[PDB]
């Protein structure tokens, strides 16, 4: 997260870290046994880390649970990045508490201008490299599909949406993928891609979760 | 033809922080770099062994 702030220990209880020997992506807990992340975050031997703040130190509220299943959307396209969503089942059910909680799925899509919370342990620099120990947060608005398409000609599908600030300086970055974009208590987006990070006229692109609610519910129930 | 082993490492547009290997011609060895998760170029390997086997001595 570039241009954000320190969330505060466990203030984003649904945020999880995907670990494969190190943190490589984020995710969102939707129930005690399921996590929503990005399709490009599919990797071997995933271990989901819940209740995390400082990802480099054991603080006492962590729950490390291996992925028992990793279901990438059947229509995911690794070239266009369309349908960039993946569902991860936890090998054992997570113990829910104030620091480990699920986030509700949306009932309807969010309108342009709606303020949302984006979080993750990704790069905090637009130019250069710096990865945080603790979870970072960013308040950013959903942008119009017209502005999103103008920013990324011929790249925005109906399953993507832009969020952020056109002037640059505030955005999600490498290491944030798969993480949440929560608006009014609903998971509206998944950190997906963009042209660099926090660049002027290049807002972050996110997977449009509201288009996948029925698929998410049915897929979880069939696994 | 152009040697793909001599191309600079490519992170790509996606926002994952996946550690991969690339052959660094200037240094003469396989080094680590951050791959974003999509649109990988060929000078991108999952292990140092894969990198050396494919680009060693380029
Ligand atoms: Ca920790
Ligand atoms: Ca290296
Ligand atoms: Na802390």
């Amino acid at each position: 997260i570039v241009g954000g702030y320190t969330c505060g220990a466990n203030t984003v209880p649904y945020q999880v870290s995907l670990n494969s020997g190190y943190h490589f992506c984020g995710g969102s807990l939707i129930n005690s046994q399921w996590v929503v992340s990005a399709a490009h975050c599919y990797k071997s031997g995933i271990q989901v880390r819940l209740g995390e703040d400082n990802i480099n130190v054991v603080e006492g509220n962590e729950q490390f649970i291996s992925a028992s299943k990793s279901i990438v959307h059947p229509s995911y396209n690794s070239n266009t990045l369309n349908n960039d969503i993946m569902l991860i089942k936890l090998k054992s059910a997570a113990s829910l508490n104030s620091r480990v909680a699920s986030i509700s799925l949306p009932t309807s899509c969010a309108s342009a201008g709606t303020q949302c919370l984006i979080s993750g342990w990704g790069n905090t620099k637009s130019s250069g490299t710096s990865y945080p120990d603790v979870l970072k947060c960013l308040k950013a608005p959903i942008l119009s599909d017209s502005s999103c398409k103008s920013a990324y000609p011929g790249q925005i599908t109906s399953n993507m949406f832009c969020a952020g600030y056109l002037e640059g300086g505030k955005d999600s970055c490498q290491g944030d993928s798969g993480g949440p974009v929560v608006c009014s208590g609903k998971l509206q987006g998944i950190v997906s891609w963009g042209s660099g990070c926090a660049q002027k006229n290049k807002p972050g692109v996110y997977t449009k979760v509201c288009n996948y609610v029925s698929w998410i519910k049915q897929t979880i129930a069939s696994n | 033809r152009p040697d793909f082993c001599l191309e600079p490492p490519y992170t790509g547009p996606s926002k994952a922080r996946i550690i991969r290997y690339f052959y660094n011609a200037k240094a003469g060895l396989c080094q680590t770099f951050v791959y974003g998760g999509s649109r990988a170029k060929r000078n991108n390997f999952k292990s140092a062994e894969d990198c050396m086997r494919t680009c060693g001595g380029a």
Side-chain angles (χ1 to χ4, degrees), chain A residues 1-124 126-223, chain B residues 1-38 40-58:
Chain A
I1 301 290
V2 180
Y5 60 96
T6 294
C7 306
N10 311 113
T11 54
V12 188
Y14 51 87
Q15 169 85 236
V16 306
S17 164
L18 302 190
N19 184 288
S20 189
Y22 60 90
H23 167 91
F24 72 93
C25 273
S28 301
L29 187 69
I30 57 172
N31 69 39
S32 72
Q33 293 170 98
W34 292 89
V35 167
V36 172
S37 187
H40 70 277
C41 289
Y42 170 75
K43 208 183 204 312
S44 281
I46 290 177
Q47 181 184 246
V48 180
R49 298 187 171 195
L50 308 97
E52 287 277 27
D53 188 39
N54 186 324
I55 50 167
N56 294 305
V57 179
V58 175
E59 298 182 293
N61 300 291
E62 302 98 336
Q63 285 184 57
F64 291 179
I65 307 174
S66 293
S68 54
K69 296 178 186 185
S70 294
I71 308 166
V72 177
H73 194 280
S75 299
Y76 171 59
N77 186 310
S78 61
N79 289 323
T80 65
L81 305 183
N82 191 210
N83 302 297
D84 194 12
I85 183 172
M86 172 178 66
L87 299 176
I88 297 171
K89 189 178 187 180
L90 301 182
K91 193 168 179 287
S92 61
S95 182
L96 305 182
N97 51 60
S98 65
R99 303 177 178 79
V100 177
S102 61
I103 185 65
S104 297
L105 288 178
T107 51
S108 64
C109 300
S111 63
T114 300
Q115 276 294 92
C116 309
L117 178 68
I118 306 177
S119 51
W121 288 277
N123 193 359
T124 61
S126 58
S127 181
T129 27
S130 183
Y131 293 89
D133 291 319
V134 301
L135 188 65
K136 297 298 176 177
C137 278
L138 174 68
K139 293 296 184 60
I142 300 298
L143 301 178
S144 70
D145 179 55
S146 184
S147 73
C148 194
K149 291 183 174 347
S150 182
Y152 299 101
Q155 300 167 255
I156 307 303
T157 68
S158 59
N159 300 306
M160 300 173 189
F161 74 88
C162 285
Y165 300 87
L166 296 181
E167 65 176 12
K170 289 180 179 178
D171 200 357
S172 51
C173 202
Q174 278 66 40
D176 289 324
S177 273
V181 174
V182 169
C183 323
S184 304
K186 306 294 184 181
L187 181 67
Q188 295 286 1
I190 301 167
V191 179
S192 186
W193 65 277
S195 177
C197 308
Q199 296 304 296
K200 184 180 177 178
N201 302 318
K202 297 296 185 176
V205 186
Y206 302 86
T207 308
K208 195 169 185 175
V209 180
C210 64
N211 288 1
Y212 302 92
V213 179
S214 291
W215 175 79
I216 294 173
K217 294 168 62 187
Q218 187 64 23
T219 302
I220 284 176
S222 57
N223 287 278
Chain B
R1 72 188 67 248
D3 190 346
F4 65 72
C5 297
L6 308 181
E7 299 292 344
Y10 182 71
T11 294
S14 295
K15 296 174 179 174
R17 196 279 300 274
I18 297 166
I19 303 169
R20 293 287 178 84
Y21 289 81
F22 78 102
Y23 181 72
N24 183 345
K26 184 178 182 179
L29 84 183
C30 292
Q31 301 187 344
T32 54
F33 81 102
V34 174
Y35 172 52
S38 77
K41 291 198 183 312
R42 293 172 294 178
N43 192 12
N44 176 328
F45 307 92
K46 296 184 177 186
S47 71
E49 288 78 11
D50 284 355
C51 177
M52 291 188 279
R53 187 183 313 115
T54 309
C55 291

